[PDB]
Every structure is written in C-alpha cells, then in structure tokens.
Amino acid sequence: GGGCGETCVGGTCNTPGCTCSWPVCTRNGLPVT
DSSP, X not given: OOSOXXXXXXXXXXXXXXXXXXXXXXXXSOOOO
C-alpha cells in the first residue's frame, strides 16, 4: 500500500510491517503493498 495509512495513536501499529511514527504509522523500508 502507500506505506502504512494506519495510526498508532494508542502506542503501536497493528501491522508489524509498520512502524510507529507517532501518531502515524509508517513502513520501515519494506515492500509496499
């Protein structure tokens, strides 16, 4: 996807491929689905 459009406002992301760049998740250089 376009990185990780999920947020980690609570503290962490749900997808382990995503990293928390609080409050937004990102994807740590991994293949982008």
